[PDB]
C-alpha cells in the first residue's frame, strides 16, 4: 500500500477484531484482548459513506434515451440520432467505470493511511517507555495495566513514568 501499513509492516489483519476497522491488541498481567479505536473507525465510516453518496449524487442527472422513429428517407437523421445516443451512453459508461476504479483505490489507500496514523499515534506517545518490535507491536519497559492501556487508547497516556 501507499502508506506501508496494511500488508506492510503489519503482516496481516486481525480476524479477532469485530467492533471496528482499526484497533489495538493488548497483553498484560490482567490478560489480553482486542479493542476497536472508535474515533478513526467512525471517521473512516463517515469518509466512505459520504464518498458513496457523492458518487451516487453526481450521477443523478445522466442521459435518458427516448425513442424516435424515422422513415426510409430519413436515414441520415436516424443515423445521427443513433450515433448521438450511443455517444452519450459511452461517455457515461466511461465516467462510471473510471470513477469506480479511482475511488476504490483512494478508499484502499485511505484505510491504509488510517492504520499508519493510528500506529503513529501510539508510537509518538510511548516514545521511550516501550520498544518498537517492527510489526505494529510495542513491548513495554514498564507494567501497563488496563487503565494505562485505555489511557493510551484515548490519547491521554501520562508519559512521566521512567523506563530503564
Amino acid at each position: 500500500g501507499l502508506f506501508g501499513a496494511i500488508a506492510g509492516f503489519i503482516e496481516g489483519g486481525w480476524q479477532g477484531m469485530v467492533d471496528g476497522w482499526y484497533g489495538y491488541h493488548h497483553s498484560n498481567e490482567q490478560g489480553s484482548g482486542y479493542a476497536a479505536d472508535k474515533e478513526s473507525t467512525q471517521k473512516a465510516i463517515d469518509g466512505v459513506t459520504n464518498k458513496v453518496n457523492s458518487i451516487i449524487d453526481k450521477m443523478n442527472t445522466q442521459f435518458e434515451a427516448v425513442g424516435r422513429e424515422f422513415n426510409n428517407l430519413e436515414r441520415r437523421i436516424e443515423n445521427l440520432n443513433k450515433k448521438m445516443e450511443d455517444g452519450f451512453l459511452d461517455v457515461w459508461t466511461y465516467n462510471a467505470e473510471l470513477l469506480v476504479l479511482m475511488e476504490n483505490e483512494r478508499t484502499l489507500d485511505f484505510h491504509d493511511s488510517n492504520v499508519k496514523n493510528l500506529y503513529d499515534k501510539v508510537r509518538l506517545q510511548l516514545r521511550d517507555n516501550a520498544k518498537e518490535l517492527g510489526n505494529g507491536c510495542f513491548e513495554f519497559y514498564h507494567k501497563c495495566d488496563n487503565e494505562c492501556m485505555e489511557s493510551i487508547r484515548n490519547g491521554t497516556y501520562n508519559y512521566p513514568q521512567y523506563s530503564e
Binding site: 500500500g1 501499513a5 496494511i6 500488508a7 503489519i10 496481516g12 489483519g13 486481525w14 480476524q15 477484531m17 469485530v18 476497522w21 482499526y22 484497533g23 489495538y24 491488541h25 493488548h26 497483553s27 482486542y34 466512505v48 458513496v52 458518487i55 451516487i56 450521477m59 443523478n60 445522466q62 435518458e64 434515451a65 427516448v66 425513442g67 424516435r68 422513429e69 424515422f70 422513415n71 445516443e85 451512453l89 462510471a96 469506480v100 476504479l101 475511488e103 476504490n104 483505490e105 478508499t107 484502499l108 484505510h111 491504509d112 492504520v115 501510539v122 516501550a130 518490535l133 505494529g136 507491536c137 510495542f138 513491548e139 513495554f140 514498564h142 507494567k143 501497563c144 492501556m149 493510551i152
Partner: protein
C-alpha cells in the same frame, strides 16, 4: 512483558473490487451499485396499465383496421407497446402522412376519447356503406377501416361535398381522413362519376389540396389502388372544412385528447404480465434501489441510470488476505 499492538479488521468475505493498478482485489466490505436483474414481464406503471397493441400497428389502431377491434375503445394508458413488425397495419395499401411525427405526438398523450364527428348516416347524396374491400376482410367478408368512410357515387352522380365541423369540446381533436388513388380511369368514373377530382381541407392553420393519382401499380394485398391517409389537430373552437368531388375518404370518428402527460412507444414482443412496477424496460420491469442498471436504455418510470457495464462494485472496507 506487557505489549500493545495496532491492527485492522479482517474477515471471511470473498467480495472483490477492481482498482486502476490491480484487478480482483479481495476486500472486507463492498457495495455493488449496478442492478442486473428484471422480471421478464410488461407491467402496469404505478397502477395504470399500458396499451398493448398486439399484431396491430399505431396506424391500424388509429384508422380502425377491422383486424384491430380489440382497440376500438381504449382506456387511459401509461405507455404504448408495439411489436417490431406488426402484421395488421394498412389493410388497404397506401401510406400515412407524417406517421413518425404522429407517433411522436402519442409519446405525450395518455388518453383518447373516440367521438363521432360526422355520422355515416348523414350522407344523403352519396353511398356510405359500399366502401368495402377484400383487402380489409372482417370475418371473411369485405370491409374497411372503421373510423373513416370510403364514400361512393349515388345514382351515377357524385355531387361536390362541403362539410364543416367545429371542435366544440375543450380538448384538442385528432382528425383523420384519406384519399383514394385508383389504378385506372374506368375505376375512377365507376366509383366517382367525375374524371377530374380534388379534396380541399382547411383550418385556421391547414390549407391543403389533394388530387388523386390514377395509375397502374403492383398489387399489395390484391390492390393496385392506394389509400393515402392524412391527419391534423383541430384546436378548441377552430373548424375543419372539407370540399370534394371525388376520392374522399371522410372522417367519421375522431379522437379527443383528454390526457397529456409522459408516455412512450415501446418496441417489445412481450405481452401483458399481470403485475405492477416503478420502472419498465422492453424486456422486463425493474424493482431496485440501485443507482445504475445494465438492462435497457429505453426506460420508463422511476428508474436507475442505464450504463453499459457488466459489473460495478465500489470498495467500502479494506484489503483482505
Amino acid at each position: 512483558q506487557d505489549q500493545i499492538c495496532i491492527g485492522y479488521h479482517a474477515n471471511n468475505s470473498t467480495e472483490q473490487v477492481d482498482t486502476i493498478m490491480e484487478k480482483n482485489v479481495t476486500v472486507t466490505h463492498a457495495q455493488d451499485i449496478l442492478e442486473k436483474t428484471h422480471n421478464g414481464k410488461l407491467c402496469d406503471l404505478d397502477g395504470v396499465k399500458p396499451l398493448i397493441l398486439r399484431d396491430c400497428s399505431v396506424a391500424g389502431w388509429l384508422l380502425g383496421n377491422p383486424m384491430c377491434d380489440e382497440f376500438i375503445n381504449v382506456p387511459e394508458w401509461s405507455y404504448i407497446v408495439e411489436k417490431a413488425n406488426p402484421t395488421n397495419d394498412l389493410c388497404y395499401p397506401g401510406s400515412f402522412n407524417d406517421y413518425e411525427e404522429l407517433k411522436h405526438l402519442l409519446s405525450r398523450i395518455n388518453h383518447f376519447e373516440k367521438i363521432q364527428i360526422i355520422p355515416k348516416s348523414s350522407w344523403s347524396d352519396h353511398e356510405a356503406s359500399s366502401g368495402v374491400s377484400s383487402a380489409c376482410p372482417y370475418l371473411g367478408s369485405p370491409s374497411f377501416f372503421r373510423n373513416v368512410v370510403w364514400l361512393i357515387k349515388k345514382n351515377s352522380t357524385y355531387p361536390t361535398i362541403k362539410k364543416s365541423y367545429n371542435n366544440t369540446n375543450q380538448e384538442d381533436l385528432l382528425v383523420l381522413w384519406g384519399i383514394h388513388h385508383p389504378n385506372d380511369a374506368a375505376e375512377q368514373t365507376r366509383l366517382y362519376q367525375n374524371p377530374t377530382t380534388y379534396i380541399s381541407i382547411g383550418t385556421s392553420t391547414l390549407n391543403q389540396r389533394l388530387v388523386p393519382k390514377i395509375a397502374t401499380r403492383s398489387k399489395v394485398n390484391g390492390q393496385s389502388g392506394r389509400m393515402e391517409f392524412f391527419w391534423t389537430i383541430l384546436k378548441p373552437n377552430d373548424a375543419i372544412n372539407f370540399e370534394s368531388n371525388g376520392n374522399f375518404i371522410a372522417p367519421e370518428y375522431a379522437y379527443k385528447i383528454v390526457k397529456k402527460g409522459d408516455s412512450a412507444i415501446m418496441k417489445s414482443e412481450l405481452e401483458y404480465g399481470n403485475c405492477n412496477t416503478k420502472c419498465q424496460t422492453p424486456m422486463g420491469a425493474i424493482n431496485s434501489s440501485m443507482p445504475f442498471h445494465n438492462i435497457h436504455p429505453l426506460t420508463i418510470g422511476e428508474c436507475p441510470k442505464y450504463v453499459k457495464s457488466n459489473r460495478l462494485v465500489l470498495a467500502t472496507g479494506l484489503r483482505n488476505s
